[PDB]
Amino acid sequence: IPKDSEGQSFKLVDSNASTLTKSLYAYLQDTSGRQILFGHQHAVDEGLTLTNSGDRVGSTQSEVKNAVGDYPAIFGWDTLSLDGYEKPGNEKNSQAQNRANVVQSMRTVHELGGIIALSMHPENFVTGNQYNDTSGDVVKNILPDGSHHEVFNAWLDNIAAFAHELTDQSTGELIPVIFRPFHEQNGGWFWWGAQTTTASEYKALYRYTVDYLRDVKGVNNFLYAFSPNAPFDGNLTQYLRTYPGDQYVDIFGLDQYDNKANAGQATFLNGLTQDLAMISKLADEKGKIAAFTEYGYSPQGFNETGNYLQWYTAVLEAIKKDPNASRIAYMQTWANFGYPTNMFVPYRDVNGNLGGDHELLPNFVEFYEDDYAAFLTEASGWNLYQDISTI
Numbered sequence: 001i002p003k004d005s006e007g008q009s010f011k012l013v014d015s016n017a018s019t020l021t022k023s024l025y026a027y028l029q030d031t032s033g034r035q036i037l038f039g040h041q042h043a044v045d046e047g048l049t050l051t052n053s054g055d056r057v058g059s060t061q062s063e064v065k066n067a068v069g070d071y072p073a074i075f076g077w078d079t080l081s082l083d084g085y086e087k088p089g090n091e092k093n094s095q096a097q098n099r100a101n102v103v104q105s106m107r108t109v110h111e112l113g114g115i116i117a118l119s120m121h122p123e124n125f126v127t128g129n130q131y132n133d134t135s136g137d138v139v140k141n142i143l144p145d146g147s148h149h150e151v152f153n154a155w156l157d158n159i160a161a162f163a164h165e166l167t168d169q170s171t172g173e174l175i176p177v178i179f180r181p182f183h184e185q186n187g188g189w190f191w192w193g194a195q196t197t198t199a200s201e202y203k204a205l206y207r208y209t210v211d212y213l214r215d216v217k218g219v220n221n222f223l224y225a226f227s228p229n230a231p232f233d234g235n236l237t238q239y240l241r242t243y244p245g246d247q248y249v250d251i252f253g254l255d256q257y258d259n260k261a262n263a264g265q266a267t268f269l270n271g272l273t274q275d276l277a278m279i280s281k282l283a284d285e286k287g288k289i290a291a292f293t294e295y296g297y298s299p300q301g302f303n304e305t306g307n308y309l310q311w312y313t314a315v316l317e318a319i320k321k322d323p324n325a326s327r328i329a330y331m332q333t334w335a336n337f338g339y340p341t342n343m344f345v346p347y348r349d350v351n352g353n354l355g356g357d358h359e360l361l362p363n364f365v366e367f368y369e370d371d372y373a374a375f376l377t378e379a380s381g382w383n384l385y386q387d388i389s390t391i
């Protein structure tokens with residue numbers, strides 16, 4: 001993985017992005033067309049094979065590691081952790097204690113050499129319910145001229161507090177985070193989605209988030225990912241309907257899951273080649289990065305048995321075969337919270353209590369063994385750009 005981007009300069013959303021943030025951005029540019037980094041949400045604290053207790057703060061156990069012998073390159077968490085709703089947070093902890101827990105777990109992974117991606121599922125600021133309550137006209141309400149504006153700033157304030165605490169203890173360096181505001185916004189299953197929010201309210205919301213964190217709060221350790229939900233039938237207009245603009249996006253992504261009952265089929269794989277080719281061309285002419293920001297067997301995970309057994313390699317093949325699509329920088333699958341709806345990475349039965357290895361394991365091993373699929377050891381060096389310049 002050659003340091004082609006070393007000594008170069010890049011238009012980042014944050015012209016004042018920190019050394020390791022710039023370095024990560026350069027590396028993502030350089031890996032493009034050479035290898036795709038594999039990511040996993042809750043890579044160190046959710047899995048059937050994990051044996052550590054409680055909130056799992058600073059865990060180095062990993063479903064994927066138990067499965068194939070190395071960690072993913074990219075370690076995912078959500079803002080829900082800061083609020084105590086997902087590990088390593090806990091609703092019985094103080095907010096500051098939850099923020100310490102998240103900082104600790106990400107420190108540990110940084111020390112392993114991993115890259116951090118932070119998704120968000122913010123509460124419904126209007127109703128006090130969660131991301132999935134779409135009522136209340138939330139976005140209009142949390143924008144500068146809305147009545148819930150200050151409650152949303154306060155939430156961003158805790159994100160900012162988190163970001164400034166997230167430093168490497170042995171170097172003093174800020175740990176970079178790939179941050180993804182308000183995803184799958186063309187869908188209508190989140191309160192910021194298109195059934196409840198105008199394209200133009202969305203654009204405003206995305207820009208505000210960036211402007212507030214970067215300029216008001218001084219967060220310098222974020223890269224910004226924009227990720228509508230596929231399929232797009234290769235229609236870029238549908239993809240860009242909510243685009244906040246060149247100055248607000250570092251990474252073009254898309255989210256796409258297959259069908260649980262009948263995965264691995266032509267339609268899905270072809271649409272994936274087509275839509276990844278599309279955002280890769282968009283990234284190219286814009287001088288940005290493209291990524292498969294969420295993918296998985298289905299929105300309800302894979303089956304206990306009777307899966308399409310070639311799934312992992314079939315997905316990687318659909319990407320590899322296309323000169324544009326194969327330039328994506330990473331692809332990340334979801335958290336193994338458990339059956340019936342949250343199994344994404346197959347397990348190796350290392351504790352001897354799951355009734356044997358999962359039927360998808362052999363193909364997940366092949367996917368891992370593909371030279372184009374980069375896990376943690378393949379992604380080392382990401383942090384080694386010294387001389388990368390901004391705007």
Ligand SMILES: C[As](C)(=O)[O-]
Nearest residue numbers: 119121183294334
């Ligand atoms: C796992 As999701 C709520 O980011 O589709």
